[PDB]
Write an enzyme that holds these catalytic residues in place. Structure first.
Site, PDB file in Angstrom:
ATOM      1  N   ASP A  46       0.829  -1.206   0.000  1.00  0.00           N
ATOM      2  CA  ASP A  46       0.000   0.000   0.000  1.00  0.00           C
ATOM      3  C   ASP A  46       0.865   1.260   0.000  1.00  0.00           C
ATOM      4  O   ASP A  46       1.653   1.481   0.926  1.00  0.00           O
ATOM      5  CB  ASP A  46      -0.963   0.017   1.198  1.00  0.00           C
ATOM      6  CG  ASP A  46      -1.888   1.224   1.173  1.00  0.00           C
ATOM      7  OD1 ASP A  46      -2.861   1.203   0.387  1.00  0.00           O
ATOM      8  OD2 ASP A  46      -1.630   2.200   1.914  1.00  0.00           O
ATOM      9  N   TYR A  51       3.000  10.093   0.712  1.00  0.00           N
ATOM     10  CA  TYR A  51       3.949   9.496   1.668  1.00  0.00           C
ATOM     11  C   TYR A  51       5.394   9.849   1.297  1.00  0.00           C
ATOM     12  O   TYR A  51       6.314   9.661   2.097  1.00  0.00           O
ATOM     13  CB  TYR A  51       3.794   7.973   1.754  1.00  0.00           C
ATOM     14  CG  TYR A  51       2.413   7.480   2.141  1.00  0.00           C
ATOM     15  CD1 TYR A  51       1.474   8.336   2.700  1.00  0.00           C
ATOM     16  CD2 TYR A  51       2.060   6.152   1.957  1.00  0.00           C
ATOM     17  CE1 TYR A  51       0.202   7.881   3.049  1.00  0.00           C
ATOM     18  CE2 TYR A  51       0.794   5.685   2.300  1.00  0.00           C
ATOM     19  CZ  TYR A  51      -0.126   6.551   2.840  1.00  0.00           C
ATOM     20  OH  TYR A  51      -1.374   6.078   3.176  1.00  0.00           O
ATOM     21  N   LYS A  80      -2.646   6.072  -4.263  1.00  0.00           N
ATOM     22  CA  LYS A  80      -3.766   6.948  -3.962  1.00  0.00           C
ATOM     23  C   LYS A  80      -3.528   8.333  -4.535  1.00  0.00           C
ATOM     24  O   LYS A  80      -2.402   8.852  -4.511  1.00  0.00           O
ATOM     25  CB  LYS A  80      -3.994   7.049  -2.443  1.00  0.00           C
ATOM     26  CG  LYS A  80      -3.825   5.724  -1.715  1.00  0.00           C
ATOM     27  CD  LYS A  80      -4.257   5.806  -0.259  1.00  0.00           C
ATOM     28  CE  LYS A  80      -3.810   4.591   0.552  1.00  0.00           C
ATOM     29  NZ  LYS A  80      -2.328   4.556   0.821  1.00  0.00           N
ATOM     30  N   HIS A 113      -7.692   9.321  -2.232  1.00  0.00           N
ATOM     31  CA  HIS A 113      -7.126   9.205  -0.888  1.00  0.00           C
ATOM     32  C   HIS A 113      -8.069   9.747   0.201  1.00  0.00           C
ATOM     33  O   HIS A 113      -8.215   9.130   1.273  1.00  0.00           O
ATOM     34  CB  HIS A 113      -5.772   9.923  -0.846  1.00  0.00           C
ATOM     35  CG  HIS A 113      -4.881   9.481   0.273  1.00  0.00           C
ATOM     36  ND1 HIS A 113      -3.512   9.394   0.140  1.00  0.00           N
ATOM     37  CD2 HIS A 113      -5.162   9.102   1.544  1.00  0.00           C
ATOM     38  CE1 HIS A 113      -2.988   8.978   1.280  1.00  0.00           C
ATOM     39  NE2 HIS A 113      -3.967   8.795   2.148  1.00  0.00           N
TER      40      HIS A 113
HETATM   41  N1  LIG Z   1      -5.992   5.806   3.492  1.00  0.00           N
HETATM   42  C1  LIG Z   1      -5.476   6.502   4.498  1.00  0.00           C
HETATM   43  O1  LIG Z   1      -5.809   7.656   4.698  1.00  0.00           O
HETATM   44  C2  LIG Z   1      -4.489   5.836   5.423  1.00  0.00           C
HETATM   45  C3  LIG Z   1      -4.300   6.339   6.708  1.00  0.00           C
HETATM   46  C4  LIG Z   1      -3.395   5.698   7.553  1.00  0.00           C
HETATM   47  C5  LIG Z   1      -2.714   4.569   7.077  1.00  0.00           C
HETATM   48  N2  LIG Z   1      -2.902   4.097   5.834  1.00  0.00           N
HETATM   49  C6  LIG Z   1      -2.155   2.910   5.363  1.00  0.00           C
HETATM   50  O2  LIG Z   1      -2.194   1.866   6.345  1.00  0.00           O
HETATM   51  C7  LIG Z   1      -0.855   1.524   6.746  1.00  0.00           C
HETATM   52  C8  LIG Z   1      -0.791   1.021   8.184  1.00  0.00           C
HETATM   53  O3  LIG Z   1      -1.237   2.022   9.096  1.00  0.00           O
HETATM   54  P1  LIG Z   1      -0.235   2.932   9.982  1.00  0.00           P
HETATM   55  O4  LIG Z   1       1.122   3.109   9.330  1.00  0.00           O
HETATM   56  O5  LIG Z   1      -1.027   4.176  10.276  1.00  0.00           O
HETATM   57  O6  LIG Z   1      -0.089   2.175  11.403  1.00  0.00           O
HETATM   58  P2  LIG Z   1      -0.046   0.617  11.839  1.00  0.00           P
HETATM   59  O7  LIG Z   1       0.254  -0.330  10.696  1.00  0.00           O
HETATM   60  O8  LIG Z   1      -1.253   0.368  12.709  1.00  0.00           O
HETATM   61  O9  LIG Z   1       1.210   0.700  12.850  1.00  0.00           O
HETATM   62  C9  LIG Z   1       2.536   0.982  12.374  1.00  0.00           C
HETATM   63  C10 LIG Z   1       3.439   0.995  13.604  1.00  0.00           C
HETATM   64  O10 LIG Z   1       3.354  -0.273  14.265  1.00  0.00           O
HETATM   65  C11 LIG Z   1       4.667  -0.794  14.469  1.00  0.00           C
HETATM   66  N3  LIG Z   1       4.629  -2.266  14.318  1.00  0.00           N
HETATM   67  C12 LIG Z   1       4.464  -2.933  13.163  1.00  0.00           C
HETATM   68  N4  LIG Z   1       4.490  -4.259  13.433  1.00  0.00           N
HETATM   69  C13 LIG Z   1       4.681  -4.417  14.758  1.00  0.00           C
HETATM   70  C14 LIG Z   1       4.786  -5.530  15.583  1.00  0.00           C
HETATM   71  N5  LIG Z   1       4.711  -6.780  15.069  1.00  0.00           N
HETATM   72  N6  LIG Z   1       4.982  -5.350  16.908  1.00  0.00           N
HETATM   73  C15 LIG Z   1       5.070  -4.112  17.427  1.00  0.00           C
HETATM   74  N7  LIG Z   1       4.968  -3.018  16.653  1.00  0.00           N
HETATM   75  C16 LIG Z   1       4.764  -3.150  15.315  1.00  0.00           C
HETATM   76  C17 LIG Z   1       5.537  -0.148  13.407  1.00  0.00           C
HETATM   77  O11 LIG Z   1       6.898  -0.065  13.826  1.00  0.00           O
HETATM   78  P3  LIG Z   1       8.165  -0.308  12.852  1.00  0.00           P
HETATM   79  O12 LIG Z   1       7.746   0.235  11.511  1.00  0.00           O
HETATM   80  O13 LIG Z   1       9.234   0.534  13.515  1.00  0.00           O
HETATM   81  O14 LIG Z   1       8.432  -1.798  12.884  1.00  0.00           O
HETATM   82  C18 LIG Z   1       4.907   1.223  13.296  1.00  0.00           C
HETATM   83  O15 LIG Z   1       5.423   2.047  14.341  1.00  0.00           O
HETATM   84  C19 LIG Z   1      -0.084   2.815   6.512  1.00  0.00           C
HETATM   85  O16 LIG Z   1       1.333   2.617   6.468  1.00  0.00           O
HETATM   86  C20 LIG Z   1      -0.678   3.233   5.179  1.00  0.00           C
HETATM   87  O17 LIG Z   1      -0.151   2.396   4.135  1.00  0.00           O
HETATM   88  C21 LIG Z   1      -3.773   4.708   5.009  1.00  0.00           C
HETATM   89  C1  LIG Z   2      -4.217  11.311   8.497  1.00  0.00           C
HETATM   90  C2  LIG Z   2      -2.974  11.617   7.735  1.00  0.00           C
HETATM   91  C3  LIG Z   2      -2.196  10.787   7.014  1.00  0.00           C
HETATM   92  C4  LIG Z   2      -2.280   9.343   6.699  1.00  0.00           C
HETATM   93  C5  LIG Z   2      -2.839   9.300   5.306  1.00  0.00           C
HETATM   94  O1  LIG Z   2      -3.546  10.165   4.796  1.00  0.00           O
HETATM   95  O2  LIG Z   2      -2.429   8.161   4.715  1.00  0.00           O
HETATM   96  C6  LIG Z   2      -1.093  11.567   6.446  1.00  0.00           C
HETATM   97  C7  LIG Z   2      -0.064  11.117   5.629  1.00  0.00           C
HETATM   98  C8  LIG Z   2       0.893  12.037   5.210  1.00  0.00           C
HETATM   99  F1  LIG Z   2       1.897  11.611   4.423  1.00  0.00           F
HETATM  100  C9  LIG Z   2       0.800  13.388   5.606  1.00  0.00           C
HETATM  101  C10 LIG Z   2      -0.241  13.830   6.434  1.00  0.00           C
HETATM  102  C11 LIG Z   2      -1.191  12.908   6.851  1.00  0.00           C
HETATM  103  C12 LIG Z   2      -2.405  12.966   7.691  1.00  0.00           C
HETATM  104  C13 LIG Z   2      -2.935  14.032   8.305  1.00  0.00           C
HETATM  105  C14 LIG Z   2      -2.431  15.413   8.346  1.00  0.00           C
HETATM  106  C15 LIG Z   2      -3.271  16.482   8.056  1.00  0.00           C
HETATM  107  C16 LIG Z   2      -2.760  17.779   8.112  1.00  0.00           C
HETATM  108  C17 LIG Z   2      -1.423  17.984   8.463  1.00  0.00           C
HETATM  109  S1  LIG Z   2      -0.778  19.600   8.543  1.00  0.00           S
HETATM  110  C18 LIG Z   2      -2.175  20.642   8.180  1.00  0.00           C
HETATM  111  O3  LIG Z   2      -0.364  19.820   9.924  1.00  0.00           O
HETATM  112  O4  LIG Z   2       0.174  19.785   7.444  1.00  0.00           O
HETATM  113  C19 LIG Z   2      -0.597  16.907   8.779  1.00  0.00           C
HETATM  114  C20 LIG Z   2      -1.105  15.609   8.714  1.00  0.00           C
END
Ligand SMILES: NC(=O)c1ccc[n+]([C@@H]2O[C@H](COP(=O)([O-])OP(=O)(O)OC[C@H]3O[C@@H](n4cnc5c(N)ncnc54)[C@H](OP(=O)(O)O)[C@@H]3O)[C@@H](O)[C@H]2O)c1
Ligand SMILES: CC1=C(CC(=O)O)c2cc(F)ccc2/C1=C\c1ccc(S(C)(=O)=O)cc1
Length: 318
Positions: A46, A51, A80, A113
């Site tokens: 993803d 990012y 996205k 996104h």
């Molecule tokens: N569509 C959107 O708006 C949106 C928003 C948020 C996220 N996403 C996508 O979803 C993905 C996952 O969500 P996220 O990055 O927000 O958080 P997440 O996957 O819930 O958590 C990531 C964190 O958990 C740690 N971690 C991973 N595996 C672990 C394990 N086995 N034990 C302990 N800690 C562990 C990682 O550390 P290390 O990396 O240091 O191992 C990192 O600090 C994102 O990277 C992104 O691709 C999309």
């Molecule tokens: C929910 C969120 C995400 C995860 C995602 O959308 O995947 C993200 C990923 C990024 F790379 C950068 C920003 C963001 C963000 C929120 C966000 C909104 C505003 C600001 S400000 C106004 O302070 O510039 C900073 C962060």
């Protein structure tokens, strides 16, 4: 564990239910992270332009293709469209930049996104003299039509949405002249934000849900000590212990058993491998209902900067 690795999308393609997340993965670490992921079995990555690490993700994918560790057909690459590119005339280019960075000739899935369009420019979050995000006058339906064009040009195999509430999903499904339905709605989902209503709505329409931040995004930049912590919740650690698995593995297995796709992020080789070892055990119906009971409607990603945007998605209940 009675669990197939892929599910069927409404475009006729199969999507791996476990992917690697890449938000926050440093550019100097994400190439190695993605290589390890593919080596240990991940086939779905993803990504997002916002990012800022797609080039480095692309290096990993390309090397593994060149090394013949995997074929392109076996990969499912997701990216996205960022909010500053919602304008009809900007969508193709935004997609092509992603394709070029990832070193791919197509995406398996391209998502809007966020439902919120922002003023185009170099800044990902254009703010006014007082700090509010400057909206674009684009609406989600014309943006959707632009996404449909990408399918018809061969740039993407499937299109979808992310962070759409159920009324916004409905707006697209009821779009006049709708050509392709969204294959996927990627939303935040974990035991503190269980999303029963939105998930049921989407699944009832044949839209697959991808659960993001499944571990509670402990590395989110805005985290505070007082925030609840899934990974440290003794109630969840108990369920993990009972099954001889890690807390993270339970948190990853949880959405899988709800017919969700899930995309945990890690740049740690040992966790990348551990996180994939979740096809060998089953949570009971009781475990599942117990995890669901921990819901507190708590959001990692609330986009607090855009609460006045007409299309801000989280005023609605779901
Ligand atoms: N569509 C959107 O708006 C949106 C928003 C948020 C996220 N996403 C996508 O979803 C993905 C996952 O969500 P996220 O990055 O927000 O958080 P997440 O996957 O819930 O958590 C990531 C964190 O958990 C740690 N971690 C991973 N595996 C672990 C394990 N086995 N034990 C302990 N800690 C562990 C990682 O550390 P290390 O990396 O240091 O191992 C990192 O600090 C994102 O990277 C992104 O691709 C999309
Ligand atoms: C929910 C969120 C995400 C995860 C995602 O959308 O995947 C993200 C990923 C990024 F790379 C950068 C920003 C963001 C963000 C929120 C966000 C909104 C505003 C600001 S400000 C106004 O302070 O510039 C900073 C962060």
């Amino acid at each position: 564990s009675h669990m197939a690795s892929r599910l069927l999308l409404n475009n006729g393609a199969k999507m791996p239910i476990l992917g690697l997340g890449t938000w926050k993965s440093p550019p100097g670490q994400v190439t190695e992270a993605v290589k390890v992921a593919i080596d240990v079995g991940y086939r779905h990555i993803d990504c997002a332009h916002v990012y800022q690490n797609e080039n480095e993700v692309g290096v990993a994918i390309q090397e593994k293709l060149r090394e013949q560790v995997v074929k392109r057909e076996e990969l499912f690459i997701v990216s996205k469209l960022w909010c500053t590119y919602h304008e009809k005339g900007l969508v193709k280019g935004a997609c092509q930049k992603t394709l070029s960075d990832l070193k791919l000739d197509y995406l398996d899935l391209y998502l809007i996104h966020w439902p919120t369009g922002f003023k185009p420019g170099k800044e990902f979050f254009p703010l006014d003299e007082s700090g509010n995000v400057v909206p674009s006058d684009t609406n989600i339906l014309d943006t959707w039509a632009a996404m449909e064009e990408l399918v018809d040009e061969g740039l993407v195999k499937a299109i979808g949405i992310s962070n759409f509430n159920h009324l916004q999903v409905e707006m697209i499904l009821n779009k006049p002249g709708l050509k392709y339905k969204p294959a996927v709605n990627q939303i935040e989902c974990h035991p503190y934000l269980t999303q029963e209503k939105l998930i049921q709505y989407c699944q009832s329409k044949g839209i697959v849900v991808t659960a993001y931040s499944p571990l509670g995004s402990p590395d989110r930049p805005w985290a505070k000590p007082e925030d609840p912590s899934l990974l440290e919740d003794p109630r969840i650690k108990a369920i993990a212990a009972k099954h001889n698995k890690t807390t993270a593995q339970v948190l990853i297995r949880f959405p899988m058993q709800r017919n969700l796709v899930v995309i945990p992020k890690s740049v740690t080789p040992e966790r990348i491998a551990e996180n994939f070892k979740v096809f060998d055990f089953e949570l009971s119906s009781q475990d599942m209902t117990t995890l669901l009971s921990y819901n507190r409607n708590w959001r990692v990603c609330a986009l607090l900067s855009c609460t006045s945007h007409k299309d801000y998605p989280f005023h609605e209940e779901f």
